[PDB]
Design a protein around this ligand. Structure first.
Ligand SMILES: Cc1cc2nc3c(=O)[nH]c(=O)nc-3n(C[C@H](O)[C@H](O)[C@H](O)COP(=O)(O)O)c2cc1C
Ligand SMILES: Cc1cc2nc3c(=O)[nH]c(=O)nc-3n(C[C@H](O)[C@H](O)[C@H](O)COP(=O)(O)O)c2cc1C
Ligand SMILES: O=C(O)c1ccc2cc(CCc3c(C(=O)O)[nH]c(=O)[nH]c3=O)ccc2c1
Ligand SMILES: O=C(O)c1ccc2cc(CCc3c(C(=O)O)[nH]c(=O)[nH]c3=O)ccc2c1
Lengths: 313, 313
């Protein structure tokens, strides 16, 4: 029985990795992810210049999940490019680099300079499209014309396979439109579903207060709250993008949750909230748990059940 | 200390009611809700003609909430109109009738008939701005021009104060656009936030199957999964629509959850999944729990804390 995968011309010991943003901002965090049992890691979404992000408290977690308005704190692109080019040990596992420029021009600037490193060292680009653009307009992936522009400019600038990180959608017409846009771009080889569920609001009953400071307490939701949403999106894109991979992200706490993602169509399975809460030991647990469900069911490999969710009648 | 309140020129024993769709389809159901301790009741969204809805299984519940693709089963508008006009006992509590016509014309036709019953008996209209999927088009409340159309035509045809049932939004620009639409219409006197979170997917690990038959297992989510979404929408509209009331719906299982919805801004608090799972007994428990938390905090009225959620700094 084995959790091995070979995709995007890389070899992965297992499907598990962190979710962008969690345990991946500093060198220390990237070394820790690298030392862990995960099959891959992704670096924190970056911008051209370093950012401090939003005022604290800006992340809080609870039994059913988490809320955040981090505001894209990061060490700047040159840092993550240097980690990719000079520091990462690719003999340990593959690296994804996430970018999240605040305009199309910022993303173009970064991917231009990432290209040669991607070509030489094999770092894989994850472009975050659940990201602000002009304030007062929707985030990039909820503005299909902007999404198209972004993908056109980055495809031209970068010129190598990449993937995209998507927000969740909630309407079939949006699933249809979004996948149609993605399918215009042959270089988009993977689609990671999903980013956080936007603009949730957690309120503490005792203090009568919101729990994060930015944005009057509104923030993106992760964890147990979002698993059926995540699954839906994974499957919706898996069905609509047959020439792309789908990576699943949202609500993974256990090997059972990872199994569901994989039955929905996931190749890699990313872990955000649960990893934030439990720490990198989670990856040995998830591995063990997923192998046990496979043993019970008689599955020897991931391909035997990936995307094989049954429907009724 | 009692929970009684006045809204919309009606008196309510307490702020609780069922969520549309739950325990409200048949005469038996409406009578059961009327006999309960709820402050109000709302009928099942209706269409001009009866509908059988989608194949079963079409609802399932779990520890964290529910998933449904009911397909708008209902007894048809004439039945609900007759309930409102001849059968409901208004001395017991107010009645809301939910309409969910499949085009603007259908909604106009129903509301033209409801108006004189509203004038005579005081039944209240809740217009549902969710709808069956139509390939190539989003749900009405996710198509702002369509929403404006509906509201323009209903307002003209109906001519009396009414409310609107909204799906959740996840993007502040969308909150700003939606609330601007709503505030064009002075007759929209309440906004109910939220309907189910659209197009989730629940998968059973043992069977490797989705759990509802319609739509390849995709359906609207309710219950614990959606509470922070629901609170966000309640507060976003409460902030943006100062001349309207906001009714909260989503994720209420306890008086503490009701308390949070009121702190976010809700005037009435609707109960869907929890009511479906626990039955109408839930309303005595919710009342007791909400009064207990009020007593512990020293609140004598709902007005003392409605919309008074605190932000940080
Ligand atoms: C603290 C924190 C920071 C995050 N930062 C990013 C980010 O920089 N880029 C991104 O693509 N997603 C980011 N996300 C979203 C996660 O990658 C993930 O999509 C989301 O948390 C859902 O997965 P989960 O349910 O496992 O938490 C962040 C989430 C959290 C909790
Ligand atoms: C079985 C069922 C049927 C429902 N039908 C309707 C409906 O006819 N009209 C409507 O506005 N909302 C309908 N809903 C949505 C609920 O009114 C409510 O908005 C949603 O379930 C979230 O509240 P909850 O978390 O308390 O379940 C239905 C929900 C369920 C579970
Ligand atoms: O409050 C702001 O000014 C602000 C500015 C920049 C922002 C950029 C992002 C995208 C990164 C990200 C974040 C984050 O960094 O807040 N959190 C997530 O759950 N997902 C993400 O993709 C998300 C939110 C951001 C908010
Ligand atoms: O699947 C279909 O073809 C179909 C047809 C008509 C539909 C009408 C609605 C609106 C009623 C509704 C339902 C419902 O009746 O399924 N469930 C909810 O959670 N909220 C709602 O607002 C919701 C879904 C509908 C789906």
């Amino acid at each position: 029985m084995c959790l091995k995968l070979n995709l995007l011309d890389h070899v992965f010991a297992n499907p598990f990795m962190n979710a962008a943003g969690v345990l991946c901002s500093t060198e220390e965090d990237l070394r820790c992810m690298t030392a862990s049992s995960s099959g891959a890691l992704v670096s924190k979404s970056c911008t051209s210049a370093p950012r401090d992000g939003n005022p604290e408290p800006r992340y809080m977690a609870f039994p059913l999940g988490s809320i955040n308005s981090m505001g894209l704190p990061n060490l700047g692109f040159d840092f993550y490019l240097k980690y990719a080019s000079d520091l990462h040990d690719y003999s340990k596992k593959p690296l994804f680099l996430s970018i999240s420029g605040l305009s199309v021009e910022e993303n173009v600037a970064m991917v231009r300079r990432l290209a040669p490193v991607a070509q030489e060292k094999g770092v894989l680009l994850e472009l975050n499209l659940s990201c602000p653009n002009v304030p007062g307009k929707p985030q990039v992936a909820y503005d299909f014309e902007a999404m198209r522009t972004y993908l056109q400019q980055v495809s031209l600038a970068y010129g190598l396979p990449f993937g995209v990180k998507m927000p969740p959608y909630f309407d079939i017409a949006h699933f249809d439109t979004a996948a149609a846009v993605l399918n215009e771009f042959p270089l988009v080889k993977f689609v990671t579903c999903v980013n956080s569920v936007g603009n949730g609001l957690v309120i503490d009953a005792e203090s009568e207060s919101v729990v994060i400071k930015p944005k009057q307490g509104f923030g993106g939701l992760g964890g147990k709250y979002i698993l059926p949403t995540a699954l839906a999106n994974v499957n919706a894109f898996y069905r609509r993008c047959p020439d792309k991979l789908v990576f699943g992200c949202g609500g993974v706490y256990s090997g059972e949750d990872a199994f569901l993602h994989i039955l929905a169509g996931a190749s890699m399975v990313q872990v955000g909230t649960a990893l934030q809460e439990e720490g990198p030991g989670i990856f040995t647990r998830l591995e063990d748990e997923l192998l046990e469900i496979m043993a019970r069911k008689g599955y020897r490999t991931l391909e035997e059940f990936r995307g094989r969710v049954k429907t009724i009648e």
